[PDB]
Structure formats: structure tokens, C-alpha cells
Amino acid sequence: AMARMSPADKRKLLDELRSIYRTIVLEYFNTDAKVNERIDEFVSKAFFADISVSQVLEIHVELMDTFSKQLKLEGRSEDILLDYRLTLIDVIAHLCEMYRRSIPREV
Amino acid sequence: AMARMSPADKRKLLDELRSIYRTIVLEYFNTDAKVNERIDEFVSKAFFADISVSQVLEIHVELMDTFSKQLKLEGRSEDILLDYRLTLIDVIAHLCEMYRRSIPREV
């Protein structure tokens, strides 16, 4: 019997996005890390899992929230976390770039 | 003779985006203003003029820059201008939402 999928999988999918996304922000200012491949998966899952842009915004909020607790520990400054706005926007802008490229003129 | 178009038109097109976008931010926190129709034109021009997301980011930077000079005059606080990050992201997220909806499964 069992047989139970539910949207939870989509949520689990989001969990990975936070981990994957988290790596982006971590490797976004990297030097040789393969962010593009990393960003690709994010771009693919968001695209693959029919994900709304708002969902990513939340993952950011959640991340910025989680990191908020982090920076305080790092004794550092939120200035760094605060500059991630560029990254978060870049991430959604990246997948979005893929949507435009996936349009075979519908006229 | 004359005959001279050049990409300048695309630039002029961007000029309107700043004015249009500017109205969004202005009417974004409105009460009954027809932002949706306004956002639509923005979403259409960006889509119509094959515009990259980065271009809008610049329009924001430019706007945030211009407004920076403004808030100082308003004696108010950049906190308001600072919260526009949500709006700027919403704008690009809006047009992008239109790209996803314009995909007739290419498989």
C-alpha cells in the first residue's frame, strides 16, 4: 500500500537548493570553484521542479537569517552578508536567463 | 540618405525603463495605482527589447544612485530606498515569470 509522494519531495528539493545555493554564496566570490556547474543545478532544479522565483527569495531570507546567526558568531560584519543581495539577485537572474534562451519564438 | 538607427534606440528604450521603473517604485507601495499595467510595460519592453537582467540591475543602481542624492534632500532615511531591494528583485522576477509562462514545452 503506502504509495505516498506528496509535494514534500518539492520541499526536500528546496532543502538541497539551500545547500546548493549556500555553496554558491560560498563559492560565488571563489577563485576557481566550479560555481557555473553549481549554479546550473540550481538553475535546473528551479526550472526542473517548476519553482517560482519567490521560493528562491525565501531561501535567501532563510539563508540570510541563518547567516545572521552566523555572522554574530563570526564577530565579523553583516556587510558581507549584506552584499549578498547581488548574489541572490544573480542566482534568480541566472535561471531566468535560461528561460529566455528556451523560447523558440511562439509569435 | 541619413538612414541611421543604431542601438541608441535600445538605450532610449532604457531611459523609459528608468522612468517607468521609477513609477513602479513610486507606485509599488501604492494603494490603487495600476502598477500591474505599469509593470507589464516594463516586463514587455525588457522582453520586447531583448534586454538582459543585468541591464535592469544597472537601472536600479542608477536609480538607487539618483535617489541617494534625493533622500539626502528629503532629509529622510535611506532605509526606505534600502528596502527597494525587494522591489528591484520583484521587477526582474516579474518579467522572468513571464518567460517561464512563455515556454510551450520544448522537450
Comparing CA positions, the residue from B20, B13, B43 lying closest to residue A100 is B43
All residues of chain A having their beta carbon less than 8 Å from the beta carbon of residue B105 are none
Of A89, A93, A102, nearest to B103 by CB-CB distance is A102
Q: Does B104 touch chain A (CB under 8 A)?
A: yes
CATH fold of B1-107: 1.10.1240
CB A51 within 8 A of CB A96: no
Q: Does residue A71 sit in helix, strand or coil? A: helix
Cell numbers of A64, please? 540570510
The experimental method, as deposited, was NMR
Indicate yes or no: CB of A92 within 8 angstroms of CB of B93. yes
- Where along chain A do its domains lie? 1-107
Nearest chain B Cα distance for residue A1, angstroms = 33
8 Å CB contact of A103 and B100? no
Q: Do A106 and B106 touch (CB under 8 A)?
A: no
Whether A88 and chain B come into contact, CB under 8 Å, resolves to yes
Taken in order A30, A32, A34, A39, the sign of the CA dihedral is positive
The residues, ordered by sequence, that sit 6+ positions from A43 with a Cβ below 8 Å of its Cβ are: A94, A95, A98
Contact B54, A90 (CB under 8 A): no
CA B62, B42, A95, A51 dihedral sign is positive
* Contact criterion met (CB below 8 Å) for A39 and A94: yes
Dist. CA A63–CA A14, nearest whole Å: 12
On whether the CB atoms of residues B31 and B6 are closer than 8 A, the answer is no
Instruction: Determine the residue of chain A that is closest to B50 in CA distance.
Output: A100
Q: Closest to B103 (Cβ–Cβ): which among A52, A53, A99?
A: A99
DSSP string, B30-76: -SS--HHHHHHHHHHHHHHTT--HHHHHHHHHHHHHHHHHHHHHHTS
Which residues in chain A touch residue B99, judged by CB atoms under 8 angstroms apart?
96, 99-100, 102-103
> CB contact, 8 Å: B103 with chain A?
yes
3-class SS of residue A6? coil
In single-letter form, the type of residue at position B73 comes to L
CB A45 within 8 Å of CB A13: yes
Residue B106 dihedral angles phi and psi, to the nearest 5°: -100, -15
User: Is residue A53 classed exposed, middle or buried when 0-12, 13-18 and 19+ CB atoms within 10 A define those classes?
Assistant: buried
Please say whether the beta carbons of B16 and B10 come within 8 A.
no
Is B54 close to A88, i.e. CB distance below 8 A?
Answer: no
With residue A92 as reference, give the H or E element that holds it. helix A85-101
